[PDB]
Write a protein that binds this ligand. Structure first.
Ligand SMILES: *[C@@H]1O[C@H](CO)[C@@H](O[C@@H]2O[C@H](CO)[C@@H](O[C@@H]3O[C@H](CO[C@@H]4O[C@H](CO[C@@H]5O[C@H](CO)[C@@H](O)[C@H](O)[C@@H]5O)[C@@H](O)[C@H](O)[C@@H]4O)[C@@H](O)[C@H](O)[C@@H]3O)[C@H](O)[C@H]2NC(C)=O)[C@H](O)[C@H]1NC(C)=O
Ligand SMILES: *[C@@H]1O[C@H](CO)[C@@H](O[C@@H]2O[C@H](CO)[C@@H](O[C@@H]3O[C@H](CO[C@@H]4O[C@H](CO)[C@@H](O)[C@H](O)[C@@H]4O)[C@@H](O)[C@H](O)[C@@H]3O)[C@H](O)[C@H]2NC(C)=O)[C@H](O)[C@H]1NC(C)=O
Lengths: 48, 638
C-alpha cells in the first residue's frame, strides 16, 4: 500500500526524511530514515 | 649415431621459469651437458648457468629450469639457446614475450553516483596465476579517455593484493569510466575494467526477459514468444503492468517496431508477450534477408502503486534457419592414412553457448551416431584408407523432432601426415575424451605405424606436456618389439587446468641410413574449475531469514594459507548493470586465449605436429621444426 507525502525542501545539502509506522494489536513497527540530496536551481555547462 | 635433441616452449617468457628438455639418443655412458642463453644478435650472456649430465639410468633425458632476467620499438626480440652436449653443440633461436603476467581489477559496485567512493583491488599474479611482488601503475580515465588519477604502488609483501580507493567529485561527466593498470616492466600490456557513473536510485525489484527459444526460426508461424518475469529483490513475486516492445538490430543500428508495442498485465510475478511473425515482416518492406540479423526486447514494468519502475532488455536474439551450429575448431586438420581419425564435433546454439544432447553423424555410415556432452563436444571416430588423398568429412546433426531441412551441416578437409622421405611411418595418439577432472587418470594410447623391418628399432616414446604455455612434464614410454599399442597411465593433477597438450615422438635409423623423426600431438580439455576450492555458505546450520541489523555467522571453506577478499553488494545494483563482473569462467577464457597451441592435434608432418602443439624440435641430425616468428596463432582462415 502506497502512502503519498507532499514536502518542500527549504535548505540545500543532504537533508533527511523520516517516516515511522506501527500496527494496531500486533506489536510490530518499522521506521525509515533515508537521506536525499537537495540541489538548487541551475543547469550544467562546460564553458571553454 | 648419437642424436642430441632439444625441446623448449615455442615462446619464452621474461622473469619466469621455462623448462628445457634435454636428450641423447644412441648415446653411451654419461655426457656433460651445458646449457647457455645469449641475447640476439651478439653475445651478452643473459644466463650461462644450468648444466646437467645425462645418465644412462634416466634414458639420457635432462631437465634444466632457467630464468631470463630483465636488464631492458615494435619489433620482437629473440634469444639464442645453446646446448653443448660434451663437444657437439646444438643451438636454436626462440621468440621472447614481454608479458610478465596478468592483472585482475575488482570494483565493489558496477555503477557509481557522483560523490561516492570507488573501492577497487588489483590482483598481481604471474603466468602460473601464483601471486607475485611487482610494481604496478594504475590510472583512471573518464568517458572521453582522459586520465585523472595515477598511482604507483607495489604488491611487495602484500600477497598479490593491492587495495585502493578514489572519490568521485560531484562535478564530473557521467557515462562509462575505465581503470587501467599495468606492470612497470611492460607498459605495452595494459589491463582495464569499466565502471559506469550515473545519477541513479536502487529499485526494489528486478525484471527478466526470457524468450522461449534462444533464437528465432524465420519459418515459425507462432512467432517470437517472450516471458516477462518480475520479482522483488527479496524474492517475493511482483504485481504490476509491463510495457514490452521489439526491434531489429543491424551491426550497430537498431530499428524499433512501433506496431509491436504491447501492454500485458503481470500476475503472480509473471507475464506473457508474443511477437507475431506478421508484425515482424510488416516492420520491413524476402524473409531470407532478415536471416543473420538479431531481435531485441525492451520491457518496462510498473507496480500497481506507481511507486517504482524498472526497464529491462534482452538483445542478441539470432534469426537463423537452423537451431544449431557445427564447428571443427576442436578437430585436428590432419589424419593418419589407414588409422582411426577422431572427430571432435563442436555443436553450439545460434547465440554461441554449447548445445547439450544433440546427436551427430557423418555423411555416410547412417548407423554411426554420437550425442553431445555438457561441454558441447561430441565423440566421433572414423576409419581411413592407406590413401595419400585428402579426406573430406561432412558432419550432419541428427536431432529428431525436426527435419532434414532444419538441420545444420558443415564440411572440413583433413590432409595425410607426410612421412620423412615418404617412408610411411606414422604415430597416432588416441585419447578417451571425457570431462577430465583433477585427480583422475588418463589412458594415453600410442599407436605405431611402420613396416616390421624397422619396428624393432623403436623402444621408447618421448612425450611432453604443455600447460598455460610452459612445459609441465616430460618422460618416456617404454615399448617392446611387436607392440603397436601401449598405454600411458598419465595422472591428472590440479596443474593441467585448464587445457593441456601432449606431444609424442620417436626417432630411429632406417630407409637408407637416413635419420627420421615422427611425431603426433593432441589437445585435451580439463574441467573448468578452481585450481583449489573456495566455498562461502551460511554459518547458521539452521533457522530462516535474518532481520536488518542482526548478526550472522559466515562460513568460509578455502585452501590453507590462502588470503580471501570479500565484498557484499545489493542485487538491485545488478538490475541496472550485470556486465563487466568477475567470474572464474572468465579467467580460464583468458588463459585459453593466451595458449601457444593452434591446433586440436596432429599435423602435416613431424615438424608440424610439434609446432601445431606449441613446441620446437631440433636435433643433431638435422630434423627441425618450422620456424615460428609470429606471436598470435594463425589468422583464423575459416
Ligand atoms: C624435471 O625437473 C624437475 C625438477 O628437477 C623434476 O621434478 C622432480 O621429480 C621428482 C619425481 O617426479 C619429484 O617427486 C618426488 O620428490 C619427493 C621428495 O621430496 C623431494 O626431496 C628431494 C630430494 O632431496 C634429497 O634427496 C636425497 C637423495 O635421496 C636425500 O639424500 C635427501 O635426504 C633428500 O631426500 C628433492 O630433490 C625433491 O624434488 C623434493 O624436494 C620424493 O618423495 C619422490 O620419490 C619424488 O622424488 C620431485 O618433487 C621433483 N622436484 C621438485 C618438484 O622440486 C622432474 O623429475 C624432471 N622431469 C620432468 C620433465 O618433470
Ligand atoms: C561538454 O559539453 C559537450 C556538449 O556541449 C559534451 O559533448 C557531447 O555532447 C553530446 C550531446 O549532448 C553527447 O552526445 C551523446 O553521445 C552519447 C554517446 O555517444 C558518444 O559517442 C561519442 C563519439 O563516438 C563518444 O565520444 C562519447 O563518449 C559517446 O560514446 C549518445 O548516447 C547520446 O545520444 C548523445 O548524443 C556526447 O556524449 C558528449 N560528449 C561526451 C559525453 O563525451 C561533453 O561531454 C562535455 N564535456 C566534455 C569537455 O567532454
Amino acid at each position: 500500500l502506497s502512502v503519498p507525502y507532499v514536502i518542500v525542501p527549504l535548505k540545500t545539502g543532504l537533508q533527511e526524511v523520516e517516516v515511522k509506522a506501527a500496527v494496531y494489536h500486533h506489536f510490530i513497527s518499522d521506521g525509515v530514515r533515508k537521506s536525499l540530496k537537495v540541489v538548487p536551481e541551475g543547469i550544467r555547462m562546460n564553458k571553454t | 649415431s648419437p642424436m642430441y635433441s632439444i625441446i623448449t616452449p615455442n615462446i619464452l617468457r621474461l622473469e619466469s621459469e621455462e623448462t628445457m628438455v634435454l636428450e641423447a639418443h644412441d648415446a653411451q655412458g654419461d655426457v656433460p651437458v651445458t646449457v647457455t642463453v645469449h641475447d640476439f644478435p651478439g653475445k651478452k650472456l643473459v644466463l650461462s648457468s644450468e648444466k646437467t649430465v645425462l645418465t644412462p639410468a634416466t634414458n639420457h633425458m635432462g631437465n634444466v629450469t632457467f630464468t631470463i632476467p630483465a636488464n631492458r620499438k615494435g619489433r620482437n626480440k629473440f634469444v639464442t639457446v645453446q646446448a653443448t652436449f660434451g663437444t657437439q653443440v646444438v643451438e636454436k633461436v626462440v621468440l621472447v614475450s614481454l608479458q610478465s603476467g596478468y592483472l585482475f581489477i575488482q570494483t565493489d559496485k558496477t555503477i557509481y553516483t557522483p560523490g561516492s567512493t570507488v573501492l577497487y583491488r588489483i590482483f598481481t599474479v604471474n603466468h602460473k596465476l601464483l601471486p607475485v611482488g611487482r610494481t604496478v601503475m594504475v590510472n583512471i580515465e573518464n568517458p572521453e579517455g582522459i586520465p585523472v588519477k595515477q598511482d604507483s604502488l607495489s604488491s611487495q609483501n602484500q600477497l598479490g593484493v593491492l587495495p585502493l580507493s578514489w572519490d568521485i567529485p560531484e562535478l564530473v561527466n557521467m557515462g562509462q569510466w575505465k581503470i587501467r593498470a599495468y606492470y612497470e616492466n611492460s607498459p605495452q600490456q595494459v589491463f582495464s575494467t569499466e565502471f559506469e557513473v550515473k545519477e541513479y536510485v536502487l529499485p526494489s525489484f528486478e525484471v527478466i526477459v526470457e524468450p522461449t527459444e534462444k533464437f528465432y526460426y524465420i519459418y515459425n508461424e507462432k512467432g517470437l514468444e517472450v516471458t516477462i518475469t518480475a520479482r522483488f529483490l527479496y524474492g517475493k513475486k511482483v504485481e504490476g503492468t509491463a510495457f514490452v516492445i521489439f526491434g531489429i538490430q543491424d551491426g550497430e543500428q537498431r530499428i524499433s517496431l512501433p506496431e509491436s508495442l504491447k501492454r500485458i498485465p503481470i500476475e503472480d510475478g509473471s507475464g506473457e508477450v508474443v511477437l507475431s511473425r506478421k508484425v515482424l515482416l510488416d516492420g520491413v518492406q524476402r524473409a531470407e534477408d532478415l536471416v543473420g540479423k538479431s531481435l531485441y526486447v525492451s520491457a518496462t514494468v510498473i507496480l500497481h502503486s506507481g511507486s517504482d519502475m524498472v526497464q529491462a532488455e534482452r538483445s542478441g536474439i539470432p534469426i537463423v534457419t537452423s537451431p544449431y551450429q557445427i564447428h571443427f575448431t576442436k578437430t585436428p586438420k590432419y589424419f593418419k592414412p589407414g588409422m582411426p581419425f577422431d572427430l571432435m564435433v563442436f555443436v553450439t546454439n545460434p547465440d554461441g553457448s554449447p548445445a547439450y544432447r544433440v546427436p551427430v553423424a557423418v555423411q555416410g555410415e547412417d548407423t554411426v551416431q554420437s550425442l553431445t556432452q555438457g561441454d558441447g563436444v561430441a565423440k566421433l571416430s572414423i576409419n581411413t584408407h592407406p590413401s595419400q588423398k585428402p579426406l573430406s568429412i561432412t558432419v550432419r546433426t541428427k536431432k529428431q523432432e525436426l527435419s532434414e531441412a532444419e538441420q545444420a551441416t558443415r564440411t572440413m578437409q583433413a590432409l595425410p601426415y607426410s612421412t620423412v622421405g615418404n617412408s610411411n611411418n606414422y604415430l597416432h595418439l588416441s585419447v578417451l575424451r571425457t570431462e577430465l577432472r583433477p585427480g583422475e587418470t588418463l589412458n594415453v594410447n600410442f599407436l605405431l605405424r611402420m613396416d616390421r623391418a624397422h619396428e624393432a628399432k623403436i623402444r621408447y616414446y618421448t612425450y611432453l606436456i604443455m600447460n598455460k604455455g610452459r612445459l609441465l612434464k616430460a618422460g618416456r614410454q617404454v615399448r617392446e618389439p611387436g607392440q603397436d599399442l601401449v598405454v600411458l597411465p598419465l595422472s591428472i593433477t590440479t596443474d593441467f587446468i585448464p587445457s593441456f597438450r601432449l606431444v609424442a615422438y620417436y626417432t630411429l635409423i632406417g630407409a637408407s641410413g637416413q635419420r627420421e623423426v615422427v611425431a603426433d600431438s593432441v589437445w585435451v580439455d580439463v574441467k573448468d574449475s578452481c585450481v583449489g576450492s573456495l566455498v562461502v555458505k551460511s554459518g547458521q546450520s539452521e533457522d530462516r531469514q535474518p532481520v536488518p541489523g542482526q548478526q550472522m555467522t559466515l562460513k568460509i571453506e578455502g585452501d590453507h594459507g590462502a588470503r580471501v577478499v570479500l565484498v557484499a553488494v545489493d542485487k538491485g545494483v545488478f538490475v541496472l548493470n550485470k556486465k563487466n563482473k568477475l567470474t572464474q569462467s572468465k579467467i580460464w577464457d583468458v588463459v585459453e586465449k593466451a595458449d601457444i597451441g593452434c591446433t586440436p592435434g596432429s599435423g602435416k608432418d613431424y615438424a608440424g605436429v610439434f609446432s601445431d602443439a606449441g613446441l620446437t624440435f631440433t636435433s643433431s641430425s638435422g630434423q627441425q621444426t618450422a620456424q615460428r616468428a609470429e606471436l598470435q596463432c594463425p589468422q583464423p582462415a575459416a
